[PDB]
Amino acid sequence: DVPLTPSQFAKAKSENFDKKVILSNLNKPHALLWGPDNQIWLTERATGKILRVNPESGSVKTVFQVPEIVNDADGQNGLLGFAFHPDFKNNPYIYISGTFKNPKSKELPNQTIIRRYTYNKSTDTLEKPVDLLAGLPSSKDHQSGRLVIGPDQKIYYTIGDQGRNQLAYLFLPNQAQHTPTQQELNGKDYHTYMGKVLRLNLDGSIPKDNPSFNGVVSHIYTLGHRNPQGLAFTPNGKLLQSEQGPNSDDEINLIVKGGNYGWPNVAGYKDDSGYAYANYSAAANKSIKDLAQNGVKVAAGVPVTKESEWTGKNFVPPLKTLYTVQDTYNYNDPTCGEMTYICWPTVAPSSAYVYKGGKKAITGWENTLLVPSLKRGVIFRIKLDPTYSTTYDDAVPMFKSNNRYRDVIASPDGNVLYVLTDTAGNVQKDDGSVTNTLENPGSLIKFT
Amino acid sequence: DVPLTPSQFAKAKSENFDKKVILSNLNKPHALLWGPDNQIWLTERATGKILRVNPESGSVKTVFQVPEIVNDADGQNGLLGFAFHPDFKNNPYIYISGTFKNPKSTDKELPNQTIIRRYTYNKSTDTLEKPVDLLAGLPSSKDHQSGRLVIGPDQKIYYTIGDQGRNQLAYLFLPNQAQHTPTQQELNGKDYHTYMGKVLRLNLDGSIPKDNPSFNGVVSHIYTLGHRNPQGLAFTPNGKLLQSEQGPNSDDEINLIVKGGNYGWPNVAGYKDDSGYAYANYSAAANKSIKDLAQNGVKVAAGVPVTKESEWTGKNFVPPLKTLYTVQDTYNYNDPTCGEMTYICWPTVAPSSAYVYKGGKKAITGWENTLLVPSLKRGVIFRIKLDPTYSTTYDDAVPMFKSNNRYRDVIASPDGNVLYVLTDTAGNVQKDDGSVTNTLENPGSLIKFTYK
Ligand SMILES: O=C(O)c1cc(C(=O)O)c2c(n1)C(=O)C(=O)c1cc(C(=O)O)[nH]c1-2
Ligand SMILES: [Ca+2]
Ligand SMILES: [Ca+2]
Ligand SMILES: [Ca+2]
Ligand SMILES: [Ca+2]
Numbered sequence A: 001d002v003p004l005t006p007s008q009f010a011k012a013k014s015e016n017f018d019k020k021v022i023l024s025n026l027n028k029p030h031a032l033l034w035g036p037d038n039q040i041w042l043t044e045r046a047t048g049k050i051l052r053v054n055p056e057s058g059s060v061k062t063v064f065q066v067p068e069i070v071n072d073a074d075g076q077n078g079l080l081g082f083a084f085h086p087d088f089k090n091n092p093y094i095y096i097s098g099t100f101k102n103p104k105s106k107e108l109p110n111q112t113i114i115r116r117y118t119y120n121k122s123t124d125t126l127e128k129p130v131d132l133l134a135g136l137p138s139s140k141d142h143q144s145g146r147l148v149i150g151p152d153q154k155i156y157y158t159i160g161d162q163g164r165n166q167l168a169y170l171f172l173p174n175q176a177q178h179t180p181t182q183q184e185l186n187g188k189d190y191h192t193y194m195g196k197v198l199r200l201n202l203d204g205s206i207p208k209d210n211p212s213f214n215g216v217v218s219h220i221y222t223l224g225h226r227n228p229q230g231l232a233f234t235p236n237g238k239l240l241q242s243e244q245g246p247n248s249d250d251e252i253n254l255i256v257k258g259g260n261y262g263w264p265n266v267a268g269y270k271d272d273s274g275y276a277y278a279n280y281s282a283a284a285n286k287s288i289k290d291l292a293q294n295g296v297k298v299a300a301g302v303p304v305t306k307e308s309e310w311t312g313k314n315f316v317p318p319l320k321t322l323y324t325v326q327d328t329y330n331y332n333d334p335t336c337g338e339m340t341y342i343c344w345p346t347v348a349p350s351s352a353y354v355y356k357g358g359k360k361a362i363t364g365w366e367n368t369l370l371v372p373s374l375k376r377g378v379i380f381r382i383k384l385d386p387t388y389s390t391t392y393d394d395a396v397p398m399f400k401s402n403n404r405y406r407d408v409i410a411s412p413d414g415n416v417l418y419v420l421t422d423t424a425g426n427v428q429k430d431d432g433s434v435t436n437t438l439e440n441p442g443s444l445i446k447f448t
Numbered sequence B: 001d002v003p004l005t006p007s008q009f010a011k012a013k014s015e016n017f018d019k020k021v022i023l024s025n026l027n028k029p030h031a032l033l034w035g036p037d038n039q040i041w042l043t044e045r046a047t048g049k050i051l052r053v054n055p056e057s058g059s060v061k062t063v064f065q066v067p068e069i070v071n072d073a074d075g076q077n078g079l080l081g082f083a084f085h086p087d088f089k090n091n092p093y094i095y096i097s098g099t100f101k102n103p104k105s106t107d108k109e110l111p112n113q114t115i116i117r118r119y120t121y122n123k124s125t126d127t128l129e130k131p132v133d134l135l136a137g138l139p140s141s142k143d144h145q146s147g148r149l150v151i152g153p154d155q156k157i158y159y160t161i162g163d164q165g166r167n168q169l170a171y172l173f174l175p176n177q178a179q180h181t182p183t184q185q186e187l188n189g190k191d192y193h194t195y196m197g198k199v200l201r202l203n204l205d206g207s208i209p210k211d212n213p214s215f216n217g218v219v220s221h222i223y224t225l226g227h228r229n230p231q232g233l234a235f236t237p238n239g240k241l242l243q244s245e246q247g248p249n250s251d252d253e254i255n256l257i258v259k260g261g262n263y264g265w266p267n268v269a270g271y272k273d274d275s276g277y278a279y280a281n282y283s284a285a286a287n288k289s290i291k292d293l294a295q296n297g298v299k300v301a302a303g304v305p306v307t308k309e310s311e312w313t314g315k316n317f318v319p320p321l322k323t324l325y326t327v328q329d330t331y332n333y334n335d336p337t338c339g340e341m342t343y344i345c346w347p348t349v350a351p352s353s354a355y356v357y358k359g360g361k362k363a364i365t366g367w368e369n370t371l372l373v374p375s376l377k378r379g380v381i382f383r384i385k386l387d388p389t390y391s392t393t394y395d396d397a398v399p400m401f402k403s404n405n406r407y408r409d410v411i412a413s414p415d416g417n418v419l420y421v422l423t424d425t426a427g428n429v430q431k432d433d434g435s436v437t438n439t440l441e442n443p444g445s446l447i448k449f450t451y452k
């Protein structure tokens, strides 16, 4: 899709909704869920706290604090994945993922672990931790970490590309396209588990019906992803996803078994438009600079591959891009002054939520996907047809404010939306400029 | 997708198949089907002839000639739709569509109508009889007729009817109706002027399915709207509906047809990307002396209103699964390598059909879940892979069978190791070197390709 302008974003104020702050003292609130007890459960990424909030009254309790979570102030690591077992009353388990030190490792001292806890209703806390899958890659960037349980009773988990080929990890070779050998797998070497959607058995083992990649069945379900922070099943069992792109081409994807989503060789569609793959790990010197022009303009010494020059297999294009631009696009927009990036043709989607409606369903919102935006301070509404096979029309912005929206859910009746906002960071103002003064830092807000 | 180069097309020779020309110099052969009798049945658009050909011998019989078909030598009209009833053994019916004179026409420039008609096949006398009109009074013109007719798993007729060529060439100043739908009044009067640029869904007797989608509070024969020239339409084994469609100077499409979807034409070509196309509405131009610069709306002469794809306010827009091809605004539509015939260098392939490859006991290795899309201007047949659920394409459109021919239609035998193809009798095609030729290697042919 074509980028909206600052003026278009500015007008998306959603005055048909009443706003109320439920909680405002949260630290890096990250995921929120409508729990089996009709309470809202949410996570704090850096503290590792799991909170439970009464949706009506706003009363809150800290149910548990995951010990030894590691978080960098300048990082995206910490407590990430969070889901309930679908038959909680009979299987009182909570599944998480988190950043923990890797005793087996200075560069990348940590690992990601997918862990199960048992909920004890009488004492109201979590106990009997079980590591389901450990030794997963960890870094400060592009961790993704959405964890959901599908209709098939398997765990689906997004694990980002770890930031390879950008900023602090510029010279590390991106592994989004790589898959494990049977040896690696046999040795629990999950280095290639970067830029993937994993599909695991509830005990962390490999599903016998997982797809085969380069001749091996591993935990990998799909590959070729950058930073997919949104993952959500539809009522008819399809799997929708949102994913952050570089300077362009954030994506809404339909996840299909064995698909290759193209990163880093392809951003968005395979169109050779506004992006090219500049592989710094293959560069001459590690002194070469990244001009940060999305591969369209690069310094000498770095090999560039056009999207159309890639020789990949099973490439699956996005349902929608937010956004795609042409090669004439100027990635250095003066409007954003110092924080040049905020003006890039992206929205920085932080999650993806399938709106299920209910007795008070919002008129016209049938079959919509809600996608919060960090940098634009809006929640997008994206309509799909009734079979969730295609998007209809464009991504419609809502709730414009000077806030970084991190996650969103709706009440069972469907007339109230609950959102999390970041504690700190940059956001685009109504006038297109940048501010780090957030209106509702680290909050749980409801829109009725 | 990004356009292939002349060198990439030239390499796609398909050395893994044996080629045998069964017939040549047919008169505008258009559609072909694997017959209920295991013979090849094919139509001649110009003559209205329905031919049956034997595979070993190439023996041909004119089974029937649809009377009074109207065809212009310089047009795309004539005998179009062609399908058998799915349970032919118990329902020996053949369904066609064709161009016929419209006695009720109030306009000399558009004297004809399209009629969807059923015939009964008589095995005893080996002919067609008892004609029954199912739907008459449909739009007709010399351009963008489309006319693919298939019967779905739901036992309904699905029919593509093109935008009639409005907003280009000889019909430049006529207002395109692809986005328009009938009022209840027009429907009551059987005024089907808005049945342009649509996929229609009809009951087997021609009536309106009560479960058709509603457009502006009216349920008509329209199933989807916003199409230009969709010549390909085919159901998948899991009941999904795939389609190929010709775009203007860019953005030919492979679409997934969903009930009530709006495919965007003419406001949007391919993706809604403002890239390489804009909607220049000549019917709204200041006067009829204005020229079409033929730069796909990116550059236009003064006096014609232009709307960007992103400025359109239509609803239920469905983007293509794949574009052949998409380019940027800087693209040069006046490519000198095609000389006095600039258009065959445009970033399109001119898809003429769409066929779902079903395999069989001798299925071709790697061709599972593929869609075969013949190209008129490039002289190739594309193979497009989809996942096993036919939810997305995988990779790109792979060219095959490169030759100086205009490929019109393609099917496979039940065993799946043989392809049968039709080629045009005349027209332009791109040569291996990228230049244009009107010397076709196999004019008006039925060609067999057998996997080695
Ligand atoms: O293109 C951008 O403008 C931009 C902005 C941001 C952001 O504002 O946080 C992120 C990203 N990109 C980036 O692609 C990304 O993966 C990312 C992760 C996060 C986060 O806070 O978790 N923000 C961002
Ligand atoms: Ca980005
Ligand atoms: Ca992708
Ligand atoms: Ca791209
Ligand atoms: Ca064309």
Ligand SMILES: [Ca+2]
Pocket: B226, B253, B263, B264, B265, B268, B269, B270, B320
């Ligand atoms: Ca279209």
Ligand SMILES: [Ca+2]
Pocket: B251, B268, B269, B270, B271, B272, B273, B274, B275, B277, B309
């Ligand atoms: Ca377009």
